[PDB]
Amino acid sequence: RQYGGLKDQDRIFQNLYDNYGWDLASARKQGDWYKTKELILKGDTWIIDEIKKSGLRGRGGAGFPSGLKWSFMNPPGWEKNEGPRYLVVNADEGEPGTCKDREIMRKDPHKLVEGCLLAGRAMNATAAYIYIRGEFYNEAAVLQTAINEAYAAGLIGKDACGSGYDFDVYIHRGMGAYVCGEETSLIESLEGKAGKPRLKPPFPAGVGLFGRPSTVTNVETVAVAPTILRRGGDWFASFGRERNSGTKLFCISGNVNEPCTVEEEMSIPLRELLEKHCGGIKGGWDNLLGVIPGGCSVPILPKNICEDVLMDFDALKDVQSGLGTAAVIVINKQQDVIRAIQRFAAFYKHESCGQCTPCREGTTWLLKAMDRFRTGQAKEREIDMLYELTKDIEGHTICALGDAAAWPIQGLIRNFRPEMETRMKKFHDEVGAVSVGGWMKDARVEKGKVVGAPLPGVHH
Amino acid sequence: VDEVYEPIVNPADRYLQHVSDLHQYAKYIMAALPKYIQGFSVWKDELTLHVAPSAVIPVTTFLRDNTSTQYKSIIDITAVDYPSRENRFEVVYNFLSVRHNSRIRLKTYATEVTPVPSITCLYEGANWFEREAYDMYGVFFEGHPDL
Amino acid sequence: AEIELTIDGHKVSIEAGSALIQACEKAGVTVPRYCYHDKLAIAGNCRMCLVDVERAPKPVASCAYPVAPGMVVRTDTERVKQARENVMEMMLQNHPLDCPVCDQGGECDLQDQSMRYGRDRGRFTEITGKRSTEDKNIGPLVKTSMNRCIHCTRCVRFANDIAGAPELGSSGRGNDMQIGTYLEKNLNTELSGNVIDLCPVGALTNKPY
Amino acid sequence: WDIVDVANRWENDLIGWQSSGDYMQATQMKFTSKESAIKFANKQGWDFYIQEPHHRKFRVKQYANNFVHSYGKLKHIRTK
Amino acid sequence: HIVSVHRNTENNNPSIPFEFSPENMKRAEEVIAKYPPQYKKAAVMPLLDIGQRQLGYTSISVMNYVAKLLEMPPMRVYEVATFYTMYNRTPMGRYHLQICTTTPCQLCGSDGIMEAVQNTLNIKPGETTKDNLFTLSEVECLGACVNAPMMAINDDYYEDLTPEGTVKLLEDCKAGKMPTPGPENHVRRDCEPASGQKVLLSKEPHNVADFLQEGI
Amino acid sequence: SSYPTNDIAENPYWKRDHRRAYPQTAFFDQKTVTGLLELGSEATPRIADGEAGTKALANIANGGVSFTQALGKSSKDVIYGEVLTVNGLPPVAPTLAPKQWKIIEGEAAIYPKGYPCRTFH
Amino acid sequence: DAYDKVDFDVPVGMNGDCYDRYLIRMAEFRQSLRIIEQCCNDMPAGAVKVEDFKINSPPRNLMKEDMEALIHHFLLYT
Amino acid sequence: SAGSTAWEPVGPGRDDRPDSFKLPTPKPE
Amino acid sequence: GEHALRRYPSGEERCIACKLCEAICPALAITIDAEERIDGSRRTTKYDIDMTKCIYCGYCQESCPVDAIVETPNVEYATETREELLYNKEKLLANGDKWELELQYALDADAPYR
Ligand SMILES: Cc1cc2nc3c(=O)[nH]c(=O)nc-3n(C[C@@H](O)[C@@H](O)[C@H](O)COP(=O)(O)O)c2cc1C
Ligand code: SF4
Ligand code: SF4
Ligand code: SF4
Ligand code: SF4
Ligand code: SF4
Ligand code: FES
Ligand code: FES
């Protein structure tokens, strides 16, 4: 079977492009908030079992099966914990390349609110906190307007939708941090602290927000959920391969002819997504250098792989990559791939929380080395040195930002090594010889500074 | 020379066959003199035989006169203070066989007042060494002509 | 109630919920540390207590990982040694060559654990150099050379939990994260000197000495 | 060996070195156990005082206790 | 580079008073209501933004006032205000230009935009003009990577940029009405392909009520 | 320097830490050698299976069977091969590096024929 | 050390007298000269001390630029 | 000698006994 | 040979009271005392060498991380009194100020090998 023919009969996120407005009356036509009382009255187990039958997996970057992690919040004897129980929504959208959750929360807010309600019912939650980027000011205003519509309509709060389930929905605004999208740093930022991630154990389902049970889910993962409960799970499983079920919002960006956000079925081929839902590659297919299919936290793919690769979790892991936030960043042959990867290094340097040792020091080291490999002020064995530096970070961290900072350099070194060697030959020819660390023969400390050679990346 | 090449090797790996040989050899000595040999120990071409003071003269006669163990040259006699032990001084003997090109060690124990048998009856070279052990540690060697 | 577990083949027993490093200490197994202290809360930031558990794929922090029944721990194998080497590489990336002028010399955990669990030589030769950090004035008793900070958070944890001095904290983010009072303030407490002993490096030192 | 006051340390008037009259001021024997030390001391006729060791007290330590729920007023605000 | 030390000045020091206006105090009480009563410190981030909006930058007096309100030590608030980069701890201009230089906007032309802005204003990132009008800062991805290259002026996203359009955008923000946000010159609406939509082409949506299960 | 130790990439110190890979000092009391005699070795086992062999070892760890008893009870094929050699002869004092001497005579020697000192290669 | 990589003969005498010891020592002079010739001809390249800075001091230009090198210098000399 | 290292310098060594002199592990069952 | 304390071309003295030369000295010939200088610097107040204890091994010159303590090539400093061989800080600094050129020749020849 072959994939990538998603019909509008099968598109969850209608109004992805603002043809049928966002306020409640429009969504009522769309089917939002239709039979939510009786869905609430089906109970916890039916909702969790339908979300399991759907094969719905995480949309935030780690494809853990939903329902299961929603079921971690309902062990035997949760009633005798005697406190609040929270749902947290990961509307943070720090993933360079990722734009999808924005276009969920400014152009289909009521799907998100209904999803908060239903997922909280499933996890027996007393309230929902939505953590939006501080830079998403107007989108947050839209979602607050929608929450107010739902409060005035009796759809959330005391006796939501005329049922016996009380549920409140609040917005928190994160004032700038990519690490705060992490599950536990999100929680610590909600708790009024620096968004430094926590270790696991403890798990958020036992000791999360305010020491209470908590579950962090993506905007999309909850926004779809009402449609999967209404339309019937097996429908959502009708798409994609066996363990990669469902639709998925793809933001295609970079050196593609018409940059777009689309919604296609999972396991769609990458060539089809680029050619049929975008303009194809800018300058022709064989003018392609590489594609980053899951944002900055995923290694690049060369042209040889993208011709017959399917956009799923399993296949993209089979080629030593990943489907992250489904953000496809396309790169042409006219571009400098080393500049792309060193900019991602600078990103992970700026966004490190500063807690644990390897990310703290190694993001800086990786940027210092990639700044030199951009100009060729290095040696050929320093590439293997850099690989070992990434391995000094790739499992010795609290959170996964260190892995996300290690993986792209690995991809570059795996697929684009002769470009680096060519740049280093160019430097050796055009400037002069070089030693380990970027030093030259004439380089000296003279009067408080290094004078006899270039210093890459220093701007202060 | 452009690049110097030196492999990484463990210095102990050179000794393994000889270590097994010394183990077998010590097993033979223990089986021939079970009345005397309390133990043996082996580390990197060095075999130590562990005996009591009463067992010095017999074992040394064996190590001097037996054909497979012709340790004829006395090298050193020493003492070591282990004040945590009830018998504080450990009297160490080092022997060489120029016939077989092999070295052996023999260890006994002593106190400030309990003596050890002198092996001057076997090795005249032991005289000055036993004297030094007395002078430095106080170990009394019974049988010594001029201690 | 006590449970039973295995650490390097040795079976040991401690109460449930205890940290793994406590089990290793009871078993006589030595595990490195910079941020763990028996009297301070558990932080897991140094990443130097890493050990291998059969349950887990990755190496886990002994300081934070709870003790469980029937778990098997190894503190000996190649992954653990490589992890310690890598962590000390990163730790000494931006550390200053102040060992002669540092008053912790001879009683430094960083020195001893670099000699024991780390590399013989470094591979950091970058021309842009190391990080720098300005010295703070927190009073006449504690002298600050904060290029030597390794960001363990012992000082902060002590001052905020055991002493009741919340003026010390962790300002900034990332490589530019700096321990201190965000503005010039004094560490006003009658227990301040234990910060000097808790810091395993010479970032906080005795001024009259 | 404990200190004898008149012979422990005094400064020299020439160049300022610290002179001593005590011939046991740098000697430190090391034993495997308390009992061996006591036996050796008694054999040599030395009067001794045994300073018993003070060990840390065991207490359970949980990372989760740093993030428990406060039903009432927060006792203190934890940094990390 | 992030600044993690405060040095007192005559216009930023704890002696300077600060107080929420009655409007902002009502809003702050509504914000405190959004969390449990004993965990009011969770409101430190929104209230700090309220302060940063009343007075144009997060000064030490704002941090100390928030700390007084929420019964938390001032250092716990200093840590928050230093961790999160949207808290501007130096004084700012009327318009805060935030240009993304991450890889997508670089592939699609952020450096032309940066050159245009630097040449027009004669300014470098992190500096302010003589007019107290434009503060420049190169930021990481702001979540508009499909509509790249991009920028943000004081909370509103101007997208799919050109050097020409950025220059005259700065011109009209320097004097007169500033254009409405979104893609430049309406060459696109939102995330639709610029040739046009290829997917959602009806004029009435499909109601999911028509496609429910056999149950419910 | 030398290459595999100066390398910056594939050169972990723990793969060349020979000091901490030092050989232990093996110690053999009479109990441990009658175990090797009554029972066998990991190269030539002569021990039962399961708990039976376990407490068979435990009977030697404590003073159950003595060393002389185990020597008397030992077969010909045990002694002649694990105590003595296969030929029944005792093993010689081993040599790590055997040196076979050669005498140089005549013109290549140090001193001529008359002198009382010879030359050994 | 290297006597397995250099050719020398050993003088041995009869009669156990002092004349034989004197002749032995003169032969040892000449054999030492032989060994010195061979070592001056076959002196290899490389390091002269172990390249493990936990046992030997590192070089000064690393002790004054590398942190691990200085730590090891400090500990080995204290 | 008060500056002796507080951390254990060298771990346990390496078992270099031959298998002929290690006692036999009994087969599990 | 004879010992000397060196300076920088600034004129400032190189020694920083790390006490590695005191620690490695097999003969315990070095005696050092230090404190915080008035300008906040780590510098010695006492530096003494008993030449009648010293063995002239060079371990101090190897241990110094700042090239402060050195051994000159001088051997012509015999005395009539033993109280003249208890060198102090001022003697050693004057000796360095005297022998700096010879020390510079020696260093320019020797430093790459150590
Ligand atoms: C550095 C980092 C950033 C992350 N950012 C996001 C994000 O911006 N948005 C998001 O919804 N998930 C993000 N995640 C994923 C998790 O934090 C969390 O959202 C979880 O995977 C959600 O589970 P789910 O996919 O089932 O919804 C991030 C993880 C890390 C390590
Ligand atoms: S890996 Fe980086 S972002 Fe994650 S906890 Fe460690 S320092 Fe913070
Ligand atoms: S803290 Fe330790 S390692 Fe760092 S400079 Fe001081 S003594 Fe050296
Ligand atoms: S100042 Fe010292 S004690 Fe505090 S975190 Fe830094 S290194 Fe640790
Ligand atoms: S060279 Fe002289 S002063 Fe220096 S350590 Fe050796 S004996 Fe002491
Ligand atoms: S002379 Fe050198 S080694 Fe001695 S204390 Fe001064 S700086 Fe340290
Ligand atoms: S002791 Fe566990 S990470 Fe520091
Ligand atoms: S890459 Fe510029 S908006 Fe994300």
- The number of CA neighbours under 13 Å toward the Cβ of E152 is 23
What is the CB neighbour count within 10 angstroms for residue B134? 16
Are C26 and C91 in contact, with CB atoms under 8 Å apart?
Answer: no
User: CA–CA separation, A276 vs G30, rounded Å?
Assistant: 91
Q: Which residues contact G13 (CB under 8 A, 6 or more apart)?
A: F116, F117, F118, G20, G21, G23, G24
Determine the Cα angle at A149 with ends A221 and A161, to 5°: 70
CA nearest neighbour of C24 among C45, C47, C52: C52
For this PDB entry, the determination method is: cryo-EM
Distance CA A23, CA E136 (A): 36
The runs of H, that is alpha helices, within F1-121 are 3-6, 30-38, 51-61, 67-72, 76-82
Spatial contact of C203 and C146, defined as CB atoms under 8 Å apart: yes
Question: Chain F within 8 Å of H7 (Cβ-Cβ)?
Answer: no
Local structure of residue F28 (DSSP, 8 states): E
Q: Is H8 close to C30, i.e. CB distance below 8 A?
A: yes
Instruction: Name beta bridge partners: B104.
Output: B95
| A253 membership: H or E segment, kind and range | strand A247-254
By DSSP bridging, strand I42-50 and strand I86-87 are: antiparallel
Spatial separation of the C-alpha atoms in residues G21 and G11, rounded to whole Å: 9
Report if residue E39 sits inside a domain: yes
For residue F40, give its domain range: 2-121
β C10-12/C5-7 pair status: antiparallel
Edge-to-edge strand list for the sheet holding E95-100: E134-139, E95-100, E151-153, E156-159, E182-183
- Residue among E106, E177, E101 at smallest CA distance from E137: E101
Q: Which class for E146: exposed (0-12), middle (13-18), buried (19 or more C-beta within 10 A)?
A: buried
Output the CA–CA distances (angstroms, integers) from residue B112 to B32, B64, D27, in the order listed. 32, 29, 20
**Which residues have a Cβ under 8 Å from the Cβ of C101 and sit 6 or more positions away?**
I16, I18, I42
For residue B122 the two structure tokens come to: 């076997």
CB pair distance less than 8 Å for B83 and D33: no
Q: How far apart are the C-alpha atoms of A214 and A70, rounded to whole Å? A: 10
Residue G6 burial class via C-beta count within 10 angstroms: exposed 0-12, middle 13-18, buried 19 and up: middle
Alpha helices in G1-78 (DSSP H): 18-41, 60-63, 67-77
Domain that holds residue A137: 8-231
Q: Which ligand has the nearest atom to the CA of C205?
A: 4
Look at chain E and report how many structural domains it folds into. 2
Ligand nearest to the CA of G74: 3
Interface touch B19/H20, C-beta < 8 Å: no
Contact residues, chain D, for E37 at CB < 8 Å:
none
Rounded to a whole number, what is the distance in Å from the CA of G2 to chain I's nearest CA? 23
B83:D36 CB<8 A = yes
End residue of a domain, out of E91, E106, E126: E91
Q: How many CB atoms lie within 10 A of CB A370?
A: 25
Phi-psi region of A33 (alpha: psi -120 to 50; beta: other; left: phi over 0): left
**Residue I82 labelled as part of a binding site:** no
Q: Is residue E208 in a domain?
A: no
Ligand 2 pocket test: pick from A183, A351, A355 the residue with the most ligand atoms within 8 Å of its Cβ. A355
- G37 φ, ψ (degrees, to nearest 5): -60, -50
In this structure, the residues whose C-beta lies within 6 A of any atom of ligand 2 are: A 179, 197, 352-356, 359-360, 397-399, 401-402
Please tell me the distance from the alpha carbon of residue I30 to that of residue I45, in angstroms, as a whole number.
13
Cβ of residue I94 closer than 8 Å to a chain C Cβ: no
Preferred mutation among B18, B21, B23, B47 to probe H, highest tally of H CBs within 10 A? B23
CA G78 – CA H8 distance, rounded (Å)? 17
Domain count, chain F: 1
Strand order across the beta sheet in which A247-254 lies: A260-265, A247-254, A327-332, A288-292, A301-302
> What residue ranges do the domains of chain D occupy?
1-80
Residues pairing with A87 in the sheet: A128, A215
Tokens representing E24 are 């902002």
Q: Does I64 carry a binding-site annotation?
A: yes
The whole-angstrom distance between H3's CA and the closest CA on chain F is 21
- CA–chain centroid gap for F78, Å, is 17
Can you tell me which residue has the tokens 């034989």?
G20
Best mutation target, D62, D69, D78, to test chain A (most A CBs within 10 A): D69
Q: Tell me whether A25 touches chain D (CB under 8 Å).
A: no
User: Which ligand number lies closest to the CA of residue G78?
Assistant: 6
Q: Going by C-beta distance under 8 Å and a sequence separation of 6 or more, which residues neighbour residue A325?
A: A59, A60, A61, A95, A97, A98, A100, A251, A294, A295
Identify whether the C-beta of residue C30 lies closer than 8 Å to the C-beta of residue H8: yes
Inform me whether the C-beta atom of residue G57 falls under 8 Å from chain I C-beta atoms: yes
Which of H7, H8, H14, H25 to probe the C interface (max C CBs under 10 A)? H7
Respond yes or no on whether the N-terminal peptide bond of residue C32 is cis (omega within 30° of 0). Answer: no
- Tell me if A177 sits within 8 A of A195, measured CB to CB: yes
No. of helices (H) and no. of strands (E), chain I: 3, 5
Query: Half-sphere exposure of residue A357, counting CA atoms within 13 Å on the CB side?
Result: 32
φ, ψ for residue A165, nearest 5 deg: -110, 120
How many CB pairs below 8 A link G and I?
Answer: 19
Q: Kind and range of the H or E element at I34?
A: strand I30-36
Strands (E) in B21-101, as ranges, are 39-43, 46-50, 73-81, 89-97
Q: What residue numbers bound the domain in which E143 lies?
A: 92-199
CB contact under 8 A, I65 and C105: no
Contact I24, I10 (CB under 8 A): no
Helices and strands, number each (H, E), in chain D: 1, 2
Residue type, C79: R
Closest ligand (CA of I67): 6
* Tokens 């050890």, located at residue: B116
H28 at F interface, C-beta within 8 A:
yes
For the CA of A399, the nearest atom of ligand 2: 4
Instruction: List residues of G whose CB lies inside 8 A of any F CB.
Output: 4, 9-15, 19-20, 23-24, 27, 30, 46-47, 51-52, 54-55
Strands E151-153 and E95-100: antiparallel
Q: Return the ligand number nearest the Cα of C198.
A: 4
DSSP A436: T
Question: Within 13 Å of residue I86, how many CA atoms lie on the same side as its CB?
Answer: 11
Query: Hey, of C110, C115, C124, which one would you mutate to test binding to chain G, going by the most G CBs within 10 A of its CB?
Result: C115
Cβ of I25 closer than 6 Å to ligand 5, yes or no, is: yes
Is H3 within 8 Å of C112 when comparing Cβ atoms? Answer: no
Distance between CA atoms of F90 and F79, rounded to whole angstroms? Answer: 10
In this structure, which residue's CA is closest to atom 4 in ligand 2?
A399
CA distance E203 to E205: 7
Residues after which chain G is broken (C–N above 2.5 A) are: none
How many CA within 13 A on the CB side of residue I22? 15
In a domain, E120, yes or no: yes
CA atoms in the 13 A half-sphere facing the CB of F91: 25
Q: Give residue I31 CA to ligand 5 midpoint distance, Å.
A: 11
Q: Which chains touch H (3 or more CB pairs under 8 A)?
A: B, C, F
How far, in Å, CA of H16 to CA of H21, rounded?
10
Task: Give the 3-state secondary structure percentages of chain I, helix then strand then coil, rounded to 5.
Answer: 30, 25, 45
CA atoms within 13 A on the CB side of A253: 37
- Please give the Cα distance from B46 to B113 (Å, whole number): 30
Question: Could you tell me which residues come within 8 angstroms of residue I105 by beta carbon, excluding any fewer than 6 positions away?
Answer: none
Answer for the pair E74, E59: CB distance below 8 angstroms, yes or no. Answer: no
Residue G48 contacts B where some CB pair is shorter than 8 Å: no
Q: What are the angstrom distances between the C-alpha of C97 and each of C105, C202, F119, G71, I58?
A: 11, 12, 59, 8, 23
Rounded to the nearest angstrom, the distance between the alpha carbon of C138 and the centre of ligand 7 is 27
Q: Give which of I88, I97, I70, I80 is closest to I2, Cα–Cα.
A: I70
* C154 ligand 7 Cβ < 6 A: no
CA distance C175 to A351: 10
Q: What are phi and psi of I48, to 5 degrees?
A: -125, 140
CB contact under 8 A, I86 and D16: no
What's I5's DSSP letter? E
Amino acid occupying residue C110: L
Ligand 7 binding pocket includes C44 (Cβ within 6 Å): yes
Tokens coding C194 = 């234990």
> C208: distance to nearest CA of chain H, Å?
22
Does ligand 8 come within 6 angstroms of the Cβ of E72? Answer: no
Centre of ligand 1 to C-alpha A98, Å, is 12
CB C147 within 8 A of CB C100: no
F8 and chain A: CB distance < 8 Å anywhere? yes
Burial class of residue B10 in the structure, from the number of CB atoms within 10 Å of its CB (0-12 exposed, 13-18 middle, 19+ buried): middle
- In I, which residues are within 8 Å of C100 by CB distance? 16, 18, 20, 65-66
How many angstroms from the chain centroid is the CA of residue A103? 14
- List of chains touching E (3+ CB pairs within 8 A): A, C, D
- Taking CA–CA distances from B6, the nearest residue in chain G reads G46
Residue carrying the six token digits 């839902």: A277
Partner residue opposite E5 with nearest CB, options C166, C168, C178: C178
Instruction: State the Cα–Cα distance between residues A50 and A229, nearest whole angstrom.
Output: 7
Sign of CA dihedral A32, A34, A39, A40: positive
